[PDB]
Amino acid sequence: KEQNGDVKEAASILQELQVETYGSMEKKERVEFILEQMRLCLAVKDYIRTQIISKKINTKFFQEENTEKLKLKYYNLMIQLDQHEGSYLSICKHYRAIYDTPCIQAESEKWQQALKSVVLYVILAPFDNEQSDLVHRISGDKKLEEIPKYKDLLKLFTTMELMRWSTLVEDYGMELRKGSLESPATDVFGSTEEGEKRWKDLKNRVVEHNIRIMAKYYTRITMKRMAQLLDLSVDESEAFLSNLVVNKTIFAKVDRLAGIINFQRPKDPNNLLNDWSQKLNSLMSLVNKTTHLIAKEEMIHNLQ
Amino acid sequence: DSSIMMLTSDQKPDVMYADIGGMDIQKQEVREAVELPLTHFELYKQIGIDPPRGVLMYGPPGCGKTMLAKAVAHHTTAAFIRVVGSEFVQKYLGEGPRMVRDVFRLAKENAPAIIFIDEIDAIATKRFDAQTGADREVQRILLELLNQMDGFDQNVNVKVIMATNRADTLDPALLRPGRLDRKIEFPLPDRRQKRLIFSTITSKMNLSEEVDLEDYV
Amino acid sequence: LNTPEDVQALVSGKLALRYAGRQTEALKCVAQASKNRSLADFEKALTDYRAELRDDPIISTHLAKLYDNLLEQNLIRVIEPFSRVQIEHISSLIKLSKADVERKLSQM
Amino acid sequence: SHEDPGNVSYSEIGGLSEQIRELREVIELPLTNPELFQRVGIIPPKGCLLYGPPGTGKTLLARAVASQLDCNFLKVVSSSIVDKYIGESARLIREMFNYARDHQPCIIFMDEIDAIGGRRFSEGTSADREIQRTLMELLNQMDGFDTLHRVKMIMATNRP
Amino acid sequence: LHKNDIAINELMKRYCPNSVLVIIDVKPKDLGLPTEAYISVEEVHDDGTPTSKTFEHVTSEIGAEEAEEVGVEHLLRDIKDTTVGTLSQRITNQV
Amino acid sequence: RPANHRQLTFEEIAKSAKITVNEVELLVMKALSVGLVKGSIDEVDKRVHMTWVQPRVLDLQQIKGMKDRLEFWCTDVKSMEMLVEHQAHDILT
């Protein structure tokens, strides 16, 4: 409080944390004091000092059940800690722990920004199983689908609507203008920092999603028509597909001499399932056609 | 079955051959005794050597006896069996015979089985019960051990090794060349294996950047 | 040994700084070139100090760091081909050294 | 196993100076965080020996923090390993550990390390290596060769 | 099938809800398959009548049980299991 | 269209679809995402590839397809099954 502290005041309190843990019985005073050195070491700019002291934070469990919403209200401070130094799967539990204070506050402003901060981070999360059910867990809010950007956001989630990226840039660059609510748009888009890497993460998502659905929908395709149908440039697809091959999880194929490129099976090594599919699948359905067309013969021969 | 059975399934002892600190005496000779004759058997053929029966390692307790044995178990090739000498002795004054029955029939039941016997106590069990103070008991299980030491086949590929610092309840007929031939006694420390082992133990602890360890060599 | 951090820390040692000179400059430049695996830096500061480079008769360790790095470089450059590949696909994807840094890949 | 009672306070008699703090380090803190020891790479503190007087540092004043912690507090009075079919000793060592490591940070507690009814003789006739091989297979399945997942040994005796 | 089928369907459903009747033949010289199985559900129609309990068909099949051919396969004696390669599949082909 | 042409052009698509030459890729990839057909289109020449589909009846009461394919196939595999019998005449022996 003298000079609003510094690193050397923080250097006092960091050795004055490890002593003051285990002497007496305490649950809450260390939490509502434990906020202080974490908002110090976020301003010490290191963020691995923040993760060292986060390794000091996480070792205290049973932090729910503090009576009269006392640390549920501290959850705004714990997310204020874990805002920057949390990656895009840390933001999932982060932005679902954001809901606990507006859970009973009903709050048509801070629960409204709880709605927007719980809607605007699913795309930020990578392509994983947790995306695949978090899109169904954002399914279940009541006034979030009143926001048409939730309709746009669920519209991005199943083949993403083969579109122009800048139209979605319109629809989601309106959100920094939108309302008094601006901080989810700050955290995702209105940042000249990690949020600009979230802009480029949305770039990653749109070209990566063109890969995700079109790598199913490829038989033969030209190079530059792809490159301009990826909502981006032609020669820039050199780097913009070298990243998608250090993605290294799609086996692919390209030709630069003729442009005919292709994402497909490893070049028909096993010819069997053509025979198996046709004969077994369809023609055993056809030998079932005997078994159930005599049944439908009995259907029509009810009245015949 | 052998202590569970035949290098009890999943257990690497997780002591690296590289984790051993410069034992160019120990590693080379133990390699020649056990790790080599499984591989280059035709050189033993081509020179007609009749390879050695079993190394007798000893020395100070903690210069890498059990470490080296468990490290050969870590980097084994054949059917190793980990055996502690008296973890399963069952007051049969002469269960060492049933041990060697397991050895025989399980080394030819498996691939040749390499069996190290740790904590050599298998002569002196706890229900010594005869006339004088286990003179003829310890002596009878020693001479019994000798009886199932002289006639394996010279060709039953079982590597037998002993490691304690106590050859006093052990018969000095076990030191006749032909049975426990290889004499190796380990150095206590020495110089430059302080360098080697001071380097190797720091493979995981994270070394605060100038706190050096040549001073301690 | 492939521990370049300790090469840095032990040219930073006190007796290395007691008997410093030019062969330690060769060791430090080759050390940083191995620390960052820059093959151009490696070959460059290799050729710069040839009179001190003879005193290691094992240039095979050096050209094997070249070679044994170039293995996994052509591994990450034999899987990178099927995304958007360029001029020859078999000659000059290899970091465009001059045009003919190979007879190495083809030699392998 | 689970006849094991507890104390109605941490201070059932008194004298908790090193007791609370050092027993707290030897049990509870690396079970909360193994990565601190994984800056070094070693298992958790291999366990003190509560020796001293028979009854202020032997069986009483042993369950102070145990009352507070309540994780895997079993009893081993170490007479149950000296068996009938004498190789059931090591089998019941397996039955001790392979039943213990469920409550995952385990409390290996052993009052009266060498306990059977009566007194003990010396290094002559049969007051012998029962204890040594039994105790080395104990130490075998305690640490050294075989253990798993932040199990805390606690030895507590002065009788043997 | 006939019209009384739905009446004994009405009474067979009150004993078991998912009941199933069996159309048989007394002399199957068939392809062949053995006797039939239905399923009685209510789909009523596109017509708007009171409830139509029209007989839907269950695909019928046959299982097996230990010790139930002991004398019968002994009497036939014409049992030929392992000959697939000349006849047992050309019968299926023809069929 | 009377198949055996399944890998085909694009101008009939851009003519019957009342769409242009350019907007057939949106067409085919969105129509695959709908779920009435599942064939991965040869996109390099705008060449169609198709799968399972939903019918709207054949020749006016299905005369022609039924006869000339179904009964033609009937006598095909029936008579060549008789030929299987003819060469397999006494291999049952």
Swiss-Prot record, chain B:
Subcellular location(s) per record: Cytoplasm; Nucleus
GO CC annotation: ciliary basal body; cytosol; membrane; nucleoplasm; nucleus; proteasome accessory complex; proteasome complex; proteasome regulatory particle, base subcomplex
Keyword entries, A-Z: Acetylation, ATP-binding, Cytoplasm, Nucleotide-binding, Nucleus, Phosphoprotein, Proteasome
UniProt GO MF annotations: ATP binding; ATP hydrolysis activity; proteasome-activating activity
UniProt family annotation: Belongs to the AAA ATPase family.
The protein's assembly and partners: Component of the 19S proteasome regulatory particle complex. The 26S proteasome consists of a 20S core particle (CP) and two 19S regulatory subunits (RP). The regulatory particle is made of a lid composed of 9 subunits, a base containing 6 ATPases including PSMC4 and few additional components. Interacts with NR1I3. Interacts with PAAF1. Interacts with TRIM5. Interacts with ZFAND1.
UniProt-recorded name of the protein: 26S proteasome regulatory subunit 6B
Organism: Homo sapiens
Classification of source organism: Eukaryota, Metazoa, Chordata, Craniata, Vertebrata
Name of the coding gene: PSMC4
From Swiss-Prot, chain D:
Residues the entry annotates as binding ATP: 52-59
Modified residues (Phosphoserine): 122
Modification sites for N6-acetyllysine: 84
Record's subcellular location: Cytoplasm; Nucleus
Family: Belongs to the AAA ATPase family.
Function of the molecule: Component of the 26S proteasome, a multiprotein complex involved in the ATP-dependent degradation of ubiquitinated proteins. This complex plays a key role in the maintenance of protein homeostasis by removing misfolded or damaged proteins, which could impair cellular functions, and by removing proteins whose functions are no longer required. Therefore, the proteasome participates in numerous cellular processes, including cell cycle progression, apoptosis, or DNA damage repair.
Subunit and partners: Component of the 19S proteasome regulatory particle complex. The 26S proteasome consists of a 20S core particle (CP) and two 19S regulatory subunits (RP). The regulatory particle is made of a lid composed of 9 subunits, a base containing 6 ATPases including PSMC6 and few additional components. Interacts with PAAF1.
UniProt name for this protein: 26S proteasome regulatory subunit 10B
Organism: Homo sapiens (Human)
Name of the coding gene: PSMC6
Span within the parent record: 123 to 282 of 389
From Swiss-Prot, chain E:
Crosslink position(s): Glycyl lysine isopeptide (Lys-Gly) (interchain with G-Cter in ubiquitin): 80
Top-rank taxon, per record: Eukaryota
Subunit architecture: Component of the 19S proteasome regulatory particle complex. The 26S proteasome consists of a 20S core particle (CP) and two 19S regulatory subunits (RP). The regulatory particle is made of a lid composed of 9 subunits including PSMD7, a base containing 6 ATPases and few additional components. Within the complex, PSMD7 interacts with subunit PSMD4 through their respective MPN domain. Interacts with TRIM5.
Protein function: Component of the 26S proteasome, a multiprotein complex involved in the ATP-dependent degradation of ubiquitinated proteins. This complex plays a key role in the maintenance of protein homeostasis by removing misfolded or damaged proteins, which could impair cellular functions, and by removing proteins whose functions are no longer required. Therefore, the proteasome participates in numerous cellular processes, including cell cycle progression, apoptosis, or DNA damage repair.
Note: Does not bind a metal ion.
Family named by the database record: Belongs to the peptidase M67A family.
Protein name as annotated: 26S proteasome non-ATPase regulatory subunit 7
Organism: Homo sapiens (Human)
Originating gene: PSMD7
First-to-last residue of the parent protein present: 101 to 195 of 324
UniProtKB/Swiss-Prot annotation, chain F:
GO CC term (a single one): ficolin-1-rich granule lumen
Modified positions (N6-acetyllysine) in chain numbering: 15
Molecular function per GO: structural molecule activity
Any one GO biological process: proteasome-mediated ubiquitin-dependent protein catabolic process
KW Secreted (keyword) present: no
Membrane spanning stretches: none
Keywords: Acetylation, Proteasome
Keyword check for DNA-binding: no
Protein family according to the UniProt entry: Belongs to the proteasome subunit S11 family.
Known role: Component of the 26S proteasome, a multiprotein complex involved in the ATP-dependent degradation of ubiquitinated proteins. This complex plays a key role in the maintenance of protein homeostasis by removing misfolded or damaged proteins, which could impair cellular functions, and by removing proteins whose functions are no longer required. Therefore, the proteasome participates in numerous cellular processes, including cell cycle progression, apoptosis, or DNA damage repair.
Subunit organization: Component of the 19S proteasome regulatory particle complex. The 26S proteasome consists of a 20S core particle (CP) and two 19S regulatory subunits (RP). The regulatory particle is made of a lid composed of 9 subunits including PSMD13, a base containing 6 ATPases and few additional components.
UniProt name for this protein: 26S proteasome non-ATPase regulatory subunit 13
Record organism: Homo sapiens
